[PDB]
């Protein structure tokens with residue numbers, strides 16, 4: 001059924017699965033009209049589709065042109081996510097197609113499920129987890145490729161950089177979520193942490209700095225302090 | 238005016254005939270029902286005093302044969318039967334009428350409730366939904382399952398209603414995924430009306446049979462069917478004006494005839510708030526919306 005903290009290790013078994021998050025698919029800048037009214041201006045967005053086992057990110061870029069002349073954009077965006085997600089699967093070789101797809105927001109369930117009627121053996125599933133994938137746009141390299149796009153485009157990343165060489169997927173996902181949670185709770189401080197030291201650098205083919213193992217431990221602690229932090233500042237504890 | 242005579246009434250039973258019903262006592266002298274208005278299908282149904290488990294019944298059209306009811310003490314129910322001997326049947330009925338052992342089908346003459354509930358129902362279509370071709374009449378009971386219910390287990394005893402499924406391929410055109418799923422006009426009009434039912438009357442006929450079966454017998458599949466046939470209309474943006482009006486009347490009489498104490502189970506909350514307040518046809522069911530608010534504001 002749904003996905004929560006009990007069946008939490010299922011992500012890292014050997015059934016191919018993908019997470020789909022639609023939070024950044026439709027993005028705007030609410031501004032004033034000459035008449036003192038309020039209007040939207042759309043800016044580029046992305047579908048965040050992730051294999052939690054391998055770290056492969058299928059980042060589909062959603063160009064503002066897709067919205068031109070359409071109505072009820074919030075609802076369209078969910079159908080547009082589902083269409084792109086189904087196209088991605090269809091382009092994949094059978095042996096690479098996922099056996100499940102877990103959506104981070106329950107409103108994608110029906111759009112995806114309709115788009116995937118042709119794939120009866122693929123389970124479309126919700127989750128109870130509060131995953132911080134929305135903060136995928138606080139990752140400079142990701143935000144950069146999205147805002148620069150002049151057309152629809154799909155770009156591939158490993159969101160784990162090289163981590164799997166040294167750690168298991170379970171731990172890598174936990175590092176990932178910890179990092180995105182911090183970006184979601186206080187983006188500025190989360191980023192000051194990541195780049196306070198100029199000797200550490202982000203490899204050209206990577207999204208995160210190349211931290212030694214001991215440096216990842218110092219980073220991971222500072223991120224928990226922050227998340228525990230902003231939880232006080234916010235809850236006065 | 239036709240007659241359904243009974244051999245005898247050996248067990249205490251509540252008897253039903255279209256929307257009416259009366260209590261018959263163990264071996265009370267009772268030999269049937271007279272004065273049944275020719276021209277409509279009819280249903281005659283049963284709820285034993287002893288085993289309120291299993292309501293059952295028989296759909297029948299008096300224009301299609303001479304039918305009588307006889308208790309079968311082995312299988313434990315009142316069974317409908319046909320007499321082929323046309324002249325043997327007259328003499329039996331006449332004898333029972335002369336001894337005044339029948340109840341009169343009690344039609345008040347201002348009342349078209351039955352007509353209004355059975356408008357589009359036709360014995361010929363009942364017999365395809367309920368398959369038992371050696372019999373002109375059709376047995377139904379509470380426990381019978383539908384063809385769609387068995388795909389989710391005896392095929393002979395099933396209700397073969399028209400399968401409707403909104404998250405299906407029949408229902409959703411390649412490349413119109415969103416259009417067809419938020420606006421079911423394609424499925425209603427092209428798939429179902431033109432392709433399968435042929436006309437709106439056949440559709441309304443299955444719709445009305447579905448509700449009666451649910452009302453009289455408590456058949457869950459029947460109810461799922463009726464709700465499904467309603468939702469598909471109400472979720473279609475392009476429906477002929479004459480169907481919307483017809484549907485507002487049909488529903489009106491169904492909701493009027495429902496037992497009030499039965500409404501918490503027979504009516505699906507989600508489907509009705511959606512049809513009445515959020516669907517394309519939220520403004521097209523004036524009489525159905527009216528009665529639902531005067532009489533069942535609670536569900537809403």
Ligand SMILES: Clc1ccc(C2=CCNCC2)cc1
Nearest residue numbers: 451452455456457460502503
């Ligand atoms: Cl006709 C009939 C209508 C509904 C039921 C229900 C079954 C499950 N809970 C909702 C009610 C059973 C029989």
